[PDB]
Write a protein that binds this ligand. Structure first.
Ligand SMILES: [Mg+2]
Ligand SMILES: [Mg+2]
Ligand SMILES: [Mg+2]
Ligand SMILES: [Mg+2]
Ligand SMILES: [Mg+2]
Ligand SMILES: [Mg+2]
Ligand SMILES: [Mg+2]
Ligand SMILES: [Mg+2]
Ligand SMILES: [Mg+2]
Ligand SMILES: [Mg+2]
Ligand SMILES: [Mg+2]
Ligand SMILES: [Mg+2]
Ligand SMILES: [Mg+2]
Ligand SMILES: [Mg+2]
Ligand SMILES: [Mg+2]
Ligand SMILES: [Mg+2]
Ligand SMILES: [Mg+2]
Ligand SMILES: [Mg+2]
Ligand SMILES: [Mg+2]
Lengths: 145, 206, 262
RNA sequence: CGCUACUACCGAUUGGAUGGUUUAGUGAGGCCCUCGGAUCGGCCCCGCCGGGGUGCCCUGGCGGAGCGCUGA
RNA sequence: GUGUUCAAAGCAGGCCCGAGCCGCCUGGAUACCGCAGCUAGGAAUAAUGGAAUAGGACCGCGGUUCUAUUUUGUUGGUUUU
RNA sequence: CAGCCGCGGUAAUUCCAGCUCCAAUAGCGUAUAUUAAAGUUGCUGCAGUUAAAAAGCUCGUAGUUGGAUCUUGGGAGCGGG
RNA sequence: UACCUGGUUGAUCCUGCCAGUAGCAUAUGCUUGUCUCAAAGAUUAAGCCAUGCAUGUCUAAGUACGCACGGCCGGUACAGUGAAACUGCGAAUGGCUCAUUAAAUCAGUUAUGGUUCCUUUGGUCGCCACUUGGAUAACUGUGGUAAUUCUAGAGCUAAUACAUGCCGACGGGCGCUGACCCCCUUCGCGGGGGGGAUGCGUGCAUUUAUCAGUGGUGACUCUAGAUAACCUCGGGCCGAUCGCACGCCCCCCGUGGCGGCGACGACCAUUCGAACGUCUGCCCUAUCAACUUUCGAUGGUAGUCGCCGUGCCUACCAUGGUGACCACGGGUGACGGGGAAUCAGGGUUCGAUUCCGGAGAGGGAGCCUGAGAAACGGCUACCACAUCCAAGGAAGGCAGCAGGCGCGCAAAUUACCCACUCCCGACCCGGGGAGGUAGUGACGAAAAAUAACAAUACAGGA
RNA sequence: UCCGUAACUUCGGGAUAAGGAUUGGCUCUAAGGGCUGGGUCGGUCGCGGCCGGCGCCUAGCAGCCGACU
């Protein structure tokens, strides 16, 4: 789509600017240096958990996960847990041993079935050779009568 | 768009014919690719079926075949010398199918040395003993000697091919479609086909 | 025009589905499948109109997604699945096990077989070829691909499938003196003995079939289908045995049997 | 021949009005190739730090730099 | 073909029966579809062809050539039937 | 008034009205295209002395149309009056 | 039912026309009680449109820190419903109209041994691995402009989104190098042979060149095989992938798997098709007799582009191709066909109109995404028209359902429902002015009311 | 230079009708010609001088020259 915009250069003919200060010298403006919001939510995948607390893939991850307290909800200050993705568990490992043991099959099959090759076709070749005897006979009738 | 349709032309009787429908999308062309020589640069194209073509635009290396003895190798394309279809493409150095070129000769030299053990390319005294004397060894005589001696009445290379090696670079032809593929493949000239194109080049000089 | 179709009208339809003109505007449009569109029988038609279990189509949906019906072993929950020919339709809850074979007039009648004999089927060969590594291959007419035939199997020949893992058994050839059944044209749903193959290089080949009662007709070879080793079919057959008794004969039969057959 | 009514014909005016097919110039925009490189990142070039081992580098905390090859 | 209350239409419908039959019988035909195109039979009618500066046939017979595997067991090469 | 022929100029079977009758009947008139009648566009199937109509006469390419003639019987296996 | 009547004259017989006669389809005039079916802005303007609807979608199985409910159970991450947002699929079907268009579309008929194909079905599926990186939505909060389905800056957070990149496997097997060694023979040479360290490569599909000739055809430069190299480069492919329930077997004291699904992938075949070709067939006009061609007309040779074959395009050559058996040019109240009316037999006329195919979305042109579009209820420009406006700028396409203006001889309700038929989707659950259902309706078609009866009389009759 | 050109006519013309485009420097390509040799093998003497049949570029080669468009 076609749309109108203004360039990057600044002059008088504006209405509003957006400015981001990068460091504070000394004075601490009250509107922007006394109060502070906390980061509303925490991480959710294991790798950023271990990045934060420096846990190093020796000890678990479940015990070191942030809990959200239920302030102002009404009555009960419950507390909740996010869910973790990219985690190792009995299910993902069960899935993996299925596929891989089934993917050593599909080549152990087709090899169990190469047994069927050797069996099915490579006996039927071995069966049609005891035949062809009508043929080598029927062209012996050509050759040497 | 750039179309390829055959309803914009005249009939067999030279009678006009009118556009009973407009441009479609399945009847297209695109701009030509006109591959030249230099460092590799390829652009990729999406086409009917969701498949791919590859516009090559600049190529230097190719796979070429000395077919008498069936050895393919990878070499650097030097220059373009003749083209039957048109005579401007040589001035601008475009690679299309059945263009005649010049290439390096060192790989085919090296294989021949390693195979028949003989000095391909007569140099007076400049080339006889840096390493071809080091090539000439018969460490297990009487076991490979009969072999390499049997690989003796099987070389008999032509006079004209020798002159090319002795120069440094030799003729070839192209057999692929680069704006469709992205490759330069081809073969070496030999025999009467070689005679033919030599005559054309030399006459062009006049 | 600018894409493929999704609907089908109702007076556009095949003639053997027997659709009522003054009932609606559309017909079920068999979905994509191994059998053609004209020579098939979708699941709704076999089940709502013939058997008359259900009286709507929504009812058919309510029964298919219970996983009772199953086509030729492998269950199918796509209500618009295109049934074929010589196939098997096994509910097996109440032991039905249908077979889906033509009548004499070409209408895909119902044919009940036993619990046994519902565990195989027969298939015509369409082509053969060898893939990679010299591994032969074989394609039937119902889009079912099978490696490693016996090398004494050629095109337009019949095989008996055990229906669990493919596993061909009991094959037969194309030759004079063996039964045949028709699948197209005008002599549909008739049986006979082949007796000849007149062939033309560059066109369609032809057979001159003869029925036992005396009739002798001819077809294109592609509409042919083989079921017997000579007077001996390997399957249960329907009422009529592929005859096409003429209109005057039916007139005697029914009138004479009318108010005397009861 | 004279009066009366109607239809068509020629007719100066380089007549006029609708359409349509095209020549020659100017030629919006999209697409292709050749360039261009606001901007946003790393191996880093080093200097300030550690852990690990063996004085070595691989990973986690500090500042600059050829605007190199990429990555866009 | 079928008493839709007849008909126009439409493809349905009918049976025994305490109603038990937890069901039974059924139907959803057939024809026409000019002209070109395909397939097999018949050969009157209409058009064309064949031997005239001669040609068909005869283990036909000589002979100048290539000569593929048949025999030369496997072999090296030639004529070899 | 009247599709056409025609009615009305002091006794109107035709105008304006009333009695009476006729035809179709929940339908009937009016206008305009279009079929049959049309053997008045004619292959089936017209006409061409005088009613409309055969070039002033002759030659001539494409087109259309073209003489006679080449195996007939007598038999054979049969079924009737 | 293969049919006729009046009129030229003072009378007759003939040519010959004018008028009557029966149907059918559009309009109007007069009239009207029942009931079953039932067409309807085509003809003139493919002229213009206010207002309102017609395309969206969640399973046991892609992402769940909504805190909106309240499970339950604690805190070993997450029972469970679950708005919004991200992801994948559909929006190219359907519906509407007939302006164009004259061997063109189209009907039958045959070919792709000259090509593409989402989905379905079946086959094959040989030190991120006991699991790597950062990226933004939903959310929190500061705002602009009068203006819209306009958006920015700041702080966090996920994947089957976007990237990255292992293990497994036998020196097992194959081929050409071959150090070395041996046997027999040779006076040696010759020969006649064996084992053999170290090497390089070693597939599915790609590109090319050569060699011999498992399976098939009327028809192979086919399918398969062998050798040398290449990667169509990291904007080449596959070797190799994430989720849900049921519960587990273990020479066993933690491993190897199988069982049962879903999703995706590289190649082959099928299925839905699509698109380029072959043979034959069309209305009127000669006051339309020559036409086409170095501004490709007709062939050849080489290539580019193209999913493939082809003057489809480019260079170099040749001078050809059509025509009285009607080319060429022009007209059509010309979309085509299955078919409709009339009809002794033969014919004449209509066919926009519910089925198939084609074309188009105000007139023209060019494109993105996608398997598929030169889309139009997708984008961008010029022309003609046209709505807001704070005068700076923004938004548009009823030949879709109802409705309106104009136009004219001439053509219905801003109604109810997804219950039937079918379609779409992540789906037994959601949507559908496609579709059904009532309303106006003497276009038209079928049945059928508006009196029956017995005495009183006689006009009279047998 | 390349296209395109009416009325009217004593059919000769009108016609340079009217009306449009292009026009440089430099680097390249293609086409357009001439003369000479082909009588060579043996016989024969001093590169040449006589003889019988050969191959004749018999589908046009090689060599050397030259100005213009
Ligand atoms: Mg008429
Ligand atoms: Mg008649
Ligand atoms: Mg007449
Ligand atoms: Mg007659
Ligand atoms: Mg006369
Ligand atoms: Mg005759
Ligand atoms: Mg008179
Ligand atoms: Mg009349
Ligand atoms: Mg029209
Ligand atoms: Mg039509
Ligand atoms: Mg369109
Ligand atoms: Mg409009
Ligand atoms: Mg468009
Ligand atoms: Mg649309
Ligand atoms: Mg619209
Ligand atoms: Mg409307
Ligand atoms: Mg009306
Ligand atoms: Mg009626
Ligand atoms: Mg003048």
């Amino acid at each position: 789509k076609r749309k109108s915009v203004r360039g990057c250069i600044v002059d008088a003919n504006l209405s509003v600017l957006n400015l981001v200060i990068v460091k504070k010298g000394e004075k601490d403006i009250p509107g922007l240096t006394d109060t502070t919001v906390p980061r509303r939510l925490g991480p959710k995948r294991a790798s950023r958990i271990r990045k934060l607390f420096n846990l190093s893939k020796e000890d678990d991850v479940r015990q070191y996960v942030v809990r959200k307290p239920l302030n102002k909800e009404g009555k009960k200050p419950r507390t909740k847990a996010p869910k973790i993705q990219r985690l190792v568990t009995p299910r993902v490992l069960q899935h993996k041993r299925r596929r891989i043991a089934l993917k050593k099959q599909r080549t152990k099959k087709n090899k169990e079935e190469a047994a069927e090759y050797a069996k099915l076709l490579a006996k039927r070749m071995k069966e049609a050779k005891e035949k062809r005897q009508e043929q080598i006979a029927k062209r012996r009738r050509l050759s040497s009568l | 768009g750039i179309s390829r349709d055959n309803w914009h032309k005249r009939r067999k009787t030279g009678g006009k014919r009118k556009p009973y429908h407009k441009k479609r999308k399945y009847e297209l062309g695109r701009p030509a690719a006109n591959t030249k020589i230099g460092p590799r640069r390829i652009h990729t194209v999406r086409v009917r079926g969701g498949n791919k073509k590859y516009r090559a635009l600049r190529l230097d290396v190719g796979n070429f075949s000395w077919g008498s003895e069936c050895c393919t190798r990878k070499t650097r394309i030097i220059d373009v010398v003749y083209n039957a279809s048109n005579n401007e493409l040589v001035r601008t150095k475009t690679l299309v199918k059945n263009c005649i070129v010049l290439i390096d000769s060192t790989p085919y030299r090296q294989w021949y040395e390693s195979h028949y053990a003989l000095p391909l390319g007569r140099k007076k005294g400049a080339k006889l003993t840096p390493e071809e004397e080091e090539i000439l060894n018969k460490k297990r005589s009487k076991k490979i000697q009969k072999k390499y001696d049997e690989r003796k009445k099987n070389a008999k290379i032509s006079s004209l091919l020798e002159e090319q090696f002795q120069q440094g670079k030799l003729l070839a032809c192209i057999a692929s479609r680069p704006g469709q593929c992205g490759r330069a493949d081809g073969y070496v000239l030999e025999g009467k086909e070689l005679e033919f194109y030599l005559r054309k080049i030399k006459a062009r000089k006049g | 025009a600018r894409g493929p179709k999704k609907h089908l009208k109702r007076v556009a339809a095949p003639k053997h589905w027997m659709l009522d003109k003054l009932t609606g505007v559309f017909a079920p449009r068999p979905s994509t499948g191994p059998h053609k569109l004209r020579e098939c029988l979708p699941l709704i038609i076999f089940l709502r109109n013939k058997l008359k279990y259900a009286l709507t189509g929504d009812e058919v949906k309510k029964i298919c997604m219970q996983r009772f019906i199953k086509i030729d072993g492998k269950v199918r929950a796509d209500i618009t699945y295109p049934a074929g020919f010589m196939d098997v339709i096994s509910i097996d809850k109440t032991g039905e096990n249908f077979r889906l074979i033509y009548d004499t007039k070409g209408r895909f009648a119902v044919h009940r077989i036993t619990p046994e004999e519902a565990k195989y089927k027969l298939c015509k060969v369409r082509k053969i070829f060898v893939g990679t590594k010299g591994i032969p291959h074989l394609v039937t007419h119902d889009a079912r691909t099978i490696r490693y035939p016996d090398p004494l199997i050629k095109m337009n020949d019949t095989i008996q499938i055990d229906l669990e893992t493919g596993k061909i058994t009991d094959f037969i050839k194309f030759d004079t003196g063996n039964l045949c059944m028709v699948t197209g044209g005008a002599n549909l749903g008739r049986i006979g003995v082949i007796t000849n193959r007149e062939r033309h290089p560059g066109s369609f080949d032809v057979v001159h079939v003869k029925d036992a009662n005396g009739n002798s007709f001819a077809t294109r070879l592609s509409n042919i289908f083989v079921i017997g080793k000579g007077n001996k079919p390997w399957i249960s057959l329907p009422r009529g045995k592929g005859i096409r008794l003429t209109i005057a004969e039916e007139r005697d039969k029914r009138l004479a049997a009318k108010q005397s057959s009861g």
